[PDB]
């Protein structure tokens with residue numbers, strides 16, 4: 001359950017990220033595939049090398065889905081319906097992998113927004129991502 | 141998100157448990173404290189020995205809360221509001237401990253209802269308990 | 281794992297009476313049913329379309345005996361689990377399998393699967409899970 | 415942990431430039447803020463009423479240097495982490511602390527905390543967490 005301060009914090013961070021969102025999504029993916037190699041098996045047909053156009057493309061998709069969730073942060077189950085069916089029912093992603101990607105997204109924000117990434121903002125972003133993760137893993 | 145079959149399964153199991161619920165809650169607690177000793181630190185002032193009247197009392201409380209959740213299975217956040225504030229805000233229970241207790245409740249049902257504890261019913265009860273756990277850990 | 285002698289006693293006494301032909305396929309089968317993502321870990325096994333379909337799938341049953349096998353190995357080698365499992369996914373799924381197994385044991389043994397007996401099995405499954413996650 | 419030489423290189427180069435007086439208290443402090451249940455693990459430390467109150471609490475800072483210390487120990491002993499941490503809660507909270515630390519490193523080093531450098535730290539924090547959870 002996201003407080004009004006969390007919402008305010010998450011929205012502010014999205015703010016500072018600006019149009020770098022796609023790029024940051026990409027970098028988080030790269031961080032995930034390298035730090036947690038098991039995750040790569042979900043992406044057999046991807047070239048996962050640095051600068052991959054496929055990783056770049058996908059990170060933009062992920063950032064766009066997160067932005068959509070923030071934009072409708074009080075109705076995430078609905079907004080993210082098609083995406084939770086994809087991930088759970090079709091792709092059978094292990095729920096654990098969501099904490100892995102979440103942490104990489106946090107690492108990526110921290111690496112780029114030293115001012116915005118306070119302990120409070122960190123706390124809110126973490127809850128946000130865990131909220132998104134809950135939705136995306138609800139349809140097994 | 142609990143399906144209608146899950147609801148039907150969980151309700152049927154509650155059915156078979158009958159008035160043994162309190163006793164089963166007690167046994168699950170005993171299973172938890174012995175299998176996962178870290179959990180005992182949440183209960184300093186309890187006598188945790190076998191047959192403890194305090195464990196018996198508490199297991200009845202836990203069974204009653206689970207029954208309440210089943211009885212209002214479409215409005216668990218509301219029904220369990222006071223209880224999630226207790227556990228997260230006041231008691232600061234580590235979220236991990238919920239999977240531990242959940243598993244012990246499953247073990248306890250399995251030990252007493254060999255006919256009812258099919259793979260399908262097991263699946264539904266697991267989701268149910270994870271739903272309850274999600275609620276009870278939402279207010280940190 | 282450091283199992284006390286009564287703990288070892290609790291495990292071995294129950295373990296001797298396990299139907300080694302069926303319990304492993306039950307546990308592994310319940311895992312695929314209760315935690316559907318696990319199915320992906322098994323591409324070959326073919327049909328896993330339903331619970332009834334999962335539980336009645338030869339490879340499940342086959343591989344279940346090996347899980348049991350591996351459990352026996354670990355039990356008579358708790359001194360050095362790493363060098364007994366020298367040979368596999370997030371450590372968590374091994375923990376899940378260990379807990380499903382515990383539920384199956386509880387299922388098959390009823391009253392006999394007392395809280396102390398469960399406590400002793402959790403140490404073994406934990407040890408095996410960690411060893412297998414190395 | 416089996417760290418490849420480039421991996422070891424990635425860790426040591428960054429680690430030499432860490433403010434050992436502040437990074438530990440940040441990580442531990444962020445842990446108490448991000449994961450409030452962890453506060454209970456620390457009864458003595460007194461006031462932990464807010465984020466600002468947490469981050470500015472002497473025992474936090476004090477104990478943070480020890481976390482860092484322990485990290486250094488592990489780094490120059492990755493051959494045998496068990497017998498370096500012979501001396502503590504669910505293994506998961508050690509993992510959480512390890513990841514918060516990684517976020518703090520990312521915070522302090524920015525661009526320098528590249529994906530490969532992160533990957534190498536995750537192996538260390540994982541090794542330490544597991545060792546400490548033994």
Ligand code: HEM
Pocket residue numbers: 039042043058061062065066083086087091093097098101102132133136
């Ligand atoms: C915050 C968590 C996540 C978000 C917001 C997210 C978002 C997305 C989006 C937007 C798509 C494409 C949607 C579409 O094409 O309709 C997608 C697909 C996909 N996702 Fe995720 N995802 C998340 C977590 C994960 C994780 C943890 C994994 C595996 C470790 C994963 C694996 C995949 C794969 C393999 C695809 C298909 C890729 C392709 O074939 O192009 N996702 N996800």
Ligand code: HEM
Pocket residue numbers: 179182183198201202205206223226227231233237238241242272273276
């Ligand atoms: C399915 C999960 C759980 C349920 C349904 C549940 C239910 C309850 C209920 C009904 C109460 C008393 C409510 C009241 O007095 O108003 C309670 C209190 C308490 N709970 Fe839980 N609980 C759960 C999980 C846990 C876990 C995992 C822990 C710790 C490992 C825990 C520790 C405690 C403690 C220490 C108290 C206060 C005991 C006392 O002072 O009498 N609970 N819980």
Ligand code: HEM
Pocket residue numbers: 321322323324343346347349350368377412
């Ligand atoms: C806890 C999990 C698992 C355990 C304990 C386990 C155990 C074993 C054991 C003991 C063997 C050797 C048996 C023999 O010599 O005939 C074996 C072989 C094999 N297993 Fe697994 N297994 C596990 C998971 C898996 C998974 C996820 C797969 C995915 C396909 C798999 C596929 C195979 C294959 C292809 C063989 C080769 C046949 C052989 O030489 O044994 N196993 N497994």
Ligand code: HEM
Pocket residue numbers: 455456457458477480481483484502511546
């Ligand atoms: C990852 C978690 C932790 C690490 C890495 C850690 C590390 C250390 C180290 C290296 C020392 C010895 C320092 C010295 O000799 O002065 C120490 C001492 C001590 N720590 Fe911890 N600690 C951790 C968690 C905790 C927790 C949760 C508590 C709860 C109170 C705690 C309380 C103490 C106390 C009371 C001492 C005695 C002072 C001493 O002789 O060092 N620590 N810790």
Ligand SMILES: O=N[O-]
Pocket residue numbers: 029058062
């Ligand atoms: O990368 N998650 O789709």
Ligand SMILES: O=N[O-]
Pocket residue numbers: 169198202
């Ligand atoms: O035993 N849970 O309150």
Ligand SMILES: O=N[O-]
Pocket residue numbers: 367368
């Ligand atoms: O069973 N293959 O490691």
Ligand SMILES: O=N[O-]
Pocket residue numbers: 501502
């Ligand atoms: O820091 N006491 O283990």
